[PDB]
Design a binder for this molecule. Sequence first.
Ligand SMILES: Nc1nc2c(ncn2[C@@H]2O[C@H](COP(=O)(O)OP(=O)(O)OP(=O)(O)O)[C@@H](O)[C@H]2O)c(=O)[nH]1
Ligand SMILES: Nc1nc2c(ncn2[C@@H]2O[C@H](COP(=O)(O)OP(=O)(O)OP(=O)(O)O)[C@@H](O)[C@H]2O)c(=O)[nH]1
Ligand SMILES: Nc1nc2c(ncn2[C@@H]2O[C@H](COP(=O)(O)OP(=O)(O)OP(=O)(O)O)[C@@H](O)[C@H]2O)c(=O)[nH]1
Ligand SMILES: Nc1nc2c(ncn2[C@@H]2O[C@H](COP(=O)(O)OP(=O)(O)OP(=O)(O)O)[C@@H](O)[C@H]2O)c(=O)[nH]1
Ligand SMILES: [Mg+2]
Ligand SMILES: [Mg+2]
Ligand SMILES: [Mg+2]
Ligand SMILES: [Mg+2]
Lengths: 164, 164, 164, 164
Amino acid sequence: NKEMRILMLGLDAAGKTTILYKLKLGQSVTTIPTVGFNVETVTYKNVKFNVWDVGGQDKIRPLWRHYYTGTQGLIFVVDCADRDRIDEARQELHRIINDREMRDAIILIFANKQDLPDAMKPHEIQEKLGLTRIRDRNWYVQPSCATSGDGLYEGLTWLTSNYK
Amino acid sequence: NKEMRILMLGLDAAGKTTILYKLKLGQSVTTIPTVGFNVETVTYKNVKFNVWDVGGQDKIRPLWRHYYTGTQGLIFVVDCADRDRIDEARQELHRIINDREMRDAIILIFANKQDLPDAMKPHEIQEKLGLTRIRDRNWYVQPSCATSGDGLYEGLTWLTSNYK
Amino acid sequence: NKEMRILMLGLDAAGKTTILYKLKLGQSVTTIPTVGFNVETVTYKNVKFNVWDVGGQDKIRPLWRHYYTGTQGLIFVVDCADRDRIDEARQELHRIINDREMRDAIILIFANKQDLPDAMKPHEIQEKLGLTRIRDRNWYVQPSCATSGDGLYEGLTWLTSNYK
Amino acid sequence: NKEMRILMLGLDAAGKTTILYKLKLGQSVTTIPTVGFNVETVTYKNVKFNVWDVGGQDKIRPLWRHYYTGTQGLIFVVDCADRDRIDEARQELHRIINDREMRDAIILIFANKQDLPDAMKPHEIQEKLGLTRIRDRNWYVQPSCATSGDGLYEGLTWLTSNYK
Ligand SMILES: Nc1nc2c(ncn2[C@@H]2O[C@H](COP(=O)(O)OP(=O)(O)OP(=O)(O)O)[C@@H](O)[C@H]2O)c(=O)[nH]1
Ligand SMILES: Nc1nc2c(ncn2[C@@H]2O[C@H](COP(=O)(O)OP(=O)(O)OP(=O)(O)O)[C@@H](O)[C@H]2O)c(=O)[nH]1
Ligand SMILES: Nc1nc2c(ncn2[C@@H]2O[C@H](COP(=O)(O)OP(=O)(O)OP(=O)(O)O)[C@@H](O)[C@H]2O)c(=O)[nH]1
Ligand SMILES: Nc1nc2c(ncn2[C@@H]2O[C@H](COP(=O)(O)OP(=O)(O)OP(=O)(O)O)[C@@H](O)[C@H]2O)c(=O)[nH]1
Ligand SMILES: [Mg+2]
Ligand SMILES: [Mg+2]
Ligand SMILES: [Mg+2]
Ligand SMILES: [Mg+2]
């Protein structure tokens, strides 16, 4: 019986709630923007995941500071078709991961909405996010389509196996 | 701790091995046609599934008779694009489910390969299989695309919840 | 604890699956047109509800007769905006409730999709379904909007209060 | 209980991911090109292998220097059919093995894709990589086919035998 605490952060339109509920229930759901946070538990292999879905609306950005404590892995969900805000995404990612508490956290970049006609590929995303500047911890980029569940469990497996 | 035994049967090119290993490992796999059988264990919600993948090649069709015993649910995987063998699929389904041992088995029709240009919808599948003649047990048709994992866990959840 | 068996019947596009999923999960689930049926358990106050969700296609109408046995309450879901087929809805309802097994069942009329631009009002539903001529049993009409959850728990409470 | 740390480096289209997954799962899998890296554990004989699988894109080559520390063996995977770019592999291999930390690592040259119609033979690979001029360490060239497990376990055995 193993346990791991995961924090889900990112800008709006990233699709974190869809990811979390497709993991838990297995079905796609229609969502109302979260003004606080959601806590769901997902069991996969032999490890119990306590996943925290903190909302990404601009009015509750400072709320992220209260859920860094005790985090083992960070899932930064990115809208791979929202090219206009990838700079803000990069800024937020590097503001999160360079704190004192998040130093030991595993960084998983979850590129969602790969089915869109103008979707950005994982390499262009690792370029835009400046991920090549992260050299002291494990990180990975997983393309996905959340409405179908394409790539969720593979990223969860990567989070499970790369925890040391 | 609950347990359930599942038997996977169907014609060749149905994609049962791809389904089983996309459930077990999480990745799409390259396969060689099984001349015997494969056994994998997949725990999902709270129930431990022992899934039996018996090959569907013509030369090992009589092998199906040795794995009816103790079956709680049957997954009949159907190629929803190969229209030319849906009659043999119907024949085999009704030969399986009308045995004495398989009377208490739950019937899940798994229409695979939905992304093909001439894929049959579940309505045409229920018309070609004659599933309306099954009126003494629970049954359900689930369209899927096994390479992406689209709809596998939905069918697994249906098998879990409809066992009474 | 107390138990009650409920059968959900209705035409296509009625929304029975959405109602059941909203009652069970609290989420608005994106659904796929179903062939076959589901069985789900919902606990509300102190009563355990075993709800049967049978499809509404024309080719699976005869399957309704094999799940009448033991029914305590019937939920007849009606698309309150499909004025062109309220007569078909009336035909189906009167064929159901005038059988031998369903005569002791409590009848709840569930007018869904109340927020549509041309939605019918409950009085028009009563007049079109011919419920105004039913004087020999306990029935009640409840409008609803299943995606938001409005009207669902009121109808469930009415079914609970009238079952003794 | 023996342990050994192995670092897998190479150019694009080398096939390191397929090799690692054939070693770990025993089954060839469909792969997505990584831009980060994986860490996987493979147990073979009596020795536990901690294998590092780092991507080989040009923009992530500098990340290799932060995983040299503690290396006991280096697996340099070469596309034996890419005759045009074997000089780049030679340059990179000589830049790796002549560093301060990687000087004491056991070098295994893994020529993958041996079944291709224009595949190079191990002698040609020795001559092209300049390994014939390396007289100060243990090294070994081996052809392989990752999709079938050809030569993977033999190379792992060679790495095991030469590590003391
Ligand atoms: N094409 C496509 N769109 C998606 C996918 N997942 C989510 N969306 C879109 O995401 C939008 C909904 O946003 P949310 O589900 O609320 O995402 P969120 O980040 O959790 O929102 P907040 O909780 O307010 O931060 C919908 O318009 C969907 O169309 C996907 O996998 N594919
Ligand atoms: N497009 C598509 N093709 C699939 C899918 N699943 C399986 N296939 C095809 O199925 C073929 C392989 O057959 P198998 O997966 O081995 O099915 P099988 O009946 O278990 O074969 P044997 O065990 O050898 O008898 C491949 O050519 C795949 O292209 C799928 O989800 N989508
Ligand atoms: N606006 C609105 N639409 C709804 C609501 N509930 C269901 N729908 C619509 O109903 C359609 C889906 O039909 P289903 O949920 O599958 O109903 P069903 O009777 O179980 O369908 P079948 O099983 O194929 O007979 C979708 O297009 C929804 O838009 C609702 O509460 N509000
Ligand atoms: N024929 C053949 N092709 C192979 C073999 N191994 C790998 N490939 C090919 O290699 C390609 C996949 O590239 P990867 O194995 O992911 O190489 P990579 O650069 O390490 O990818 P990343 O890990 O994401 O960086 C596929 O197109 C395969 O066809 C092999 O053993 N035989
Ligand atoms: Mg939003
Ligand atoms: Mg085959
Ligand atoms: Mg339904
Ligand atoms: Mg790799």
